[PDB]
Amino acid sequence: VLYVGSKTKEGVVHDVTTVAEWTKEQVTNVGGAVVTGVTAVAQKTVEGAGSIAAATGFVKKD
Amino acid sequence: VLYVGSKTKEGVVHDVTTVAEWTKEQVTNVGGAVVTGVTAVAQKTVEGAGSIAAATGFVKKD
Amino acid sequence: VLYVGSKTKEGVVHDVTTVAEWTKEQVTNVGGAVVTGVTAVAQKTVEGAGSIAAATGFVKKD
Amino acid sequence: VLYVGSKTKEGVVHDVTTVAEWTKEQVTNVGGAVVTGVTAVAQKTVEGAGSIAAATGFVKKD
Amino acid sequence: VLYVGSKTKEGVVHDVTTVAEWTKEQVTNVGGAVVTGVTAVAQKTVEGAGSIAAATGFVKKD
Amino acid sequence: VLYVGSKTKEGVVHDVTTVAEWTKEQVTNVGGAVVTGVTAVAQKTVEGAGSIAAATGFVKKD
């Protein structure tokens, strides 16, 4: 591995756009996950057996 | 592996667009996952047997 | 691994945009996760078996 | 000549763009003009008989 | 000539852009002009017969 | 000539941009002009017959 005069981009997230106006919202929840904001994961390396990379709105009940 | 004068992009997400106006919304939930925002995962490397990369709105009840 | 005159970007998140105006919101919750803000994870390296990288709105009840 | 609430632009040059990457170049020259940079002339008034306005890479051997 | 509430621009040059990366260059020259940088002339008034306004890379051997 | 509430700009040069990285360069010269930096001339008035306004990389051998 060697770079000579490059422009690399590994695991990037940019220029995500969202606007809200007059957005009525109701949420009822009983013992469970609920997500409403803007999630943006950006990783480079994840290792390990059985692992969980970039989980959002998760419910784990083994 | 060697780069000479390139522009690489590995695992990227950009220019995602969303707008909301007058968006009434109701959500009822009982012990389960519910997701409403904008999820944007961008990874480069994931390793490991049985792993789970980029999970969103997950329910695991083994 | 060696770089000569490059511009690398590993695990980056930028230029995420969100605006709110007149956004009525209600949330009821009983023993569960609920998230509404803007989550932005950006990592480079994660190791370890069974690990969980970048979790948001998580419920773990083993 | 009289202006009332205008926006005039006389003899202007803007937003010229040039980039260079890995640009090998050789030049041999014997008693003559050679130009390689970016020339940008912008004048308003030139007067006089036989005059020469905005000359670039000139050779005059009368 | 009279201005009332205007925005005039006479003989202007702006927002010229140039970048260099890994630009090998060789130049041989024998008794002649050679130019490589970025020339940007901006004048308003030039008068006089036989005059030479905004000359770049000139060779005059009368 | 009279101005009332204007914003004039006569003979101006601004916002010129140049960057250099890893720019190998060789120059041989024998009795001649060679220029490599960034020249930026900005005048308002020049008068006189046979005059030479804004000359760069000049060779005069009458």
Task: Give a verbal description of the structure.
The structure is a homohexamer of 62-residue chains. Chain A is an all-beta fold and 62 residues long. Helices cover 0% and strands 52% of the residues of chain A. The first copy, chain A, has no helices and six strands. The radius of gyration of chain A is 18 Å and the shape is flat. The termini of chain A are far apart. Chains A and B meet through strand 1, strand 2, strand 3, strand 4 and strand 5 of A and strand 1, strand 2, strand 3, strand 4 and strand 5 of B.
Topology, element by element:
The structure is a homohexamer of 62-residue chains.
Chain A: E1 2-4, E2 9-21, E3 34-35, E4 40-42, E5 45-46, E6 52-60
Organism (chains A, B, C, D, E, F): Homo sapiens (Human)
Family (chains A, B, C, D, E, F): Belongs to the synuclein family.
Protein name (chains A, B, C, D, E, F): Alpha-synuclein
Offer a few descriptive terms.
62 residues, mainly beta, Alpha-synuclein (chains A, B, C, D, E, F)
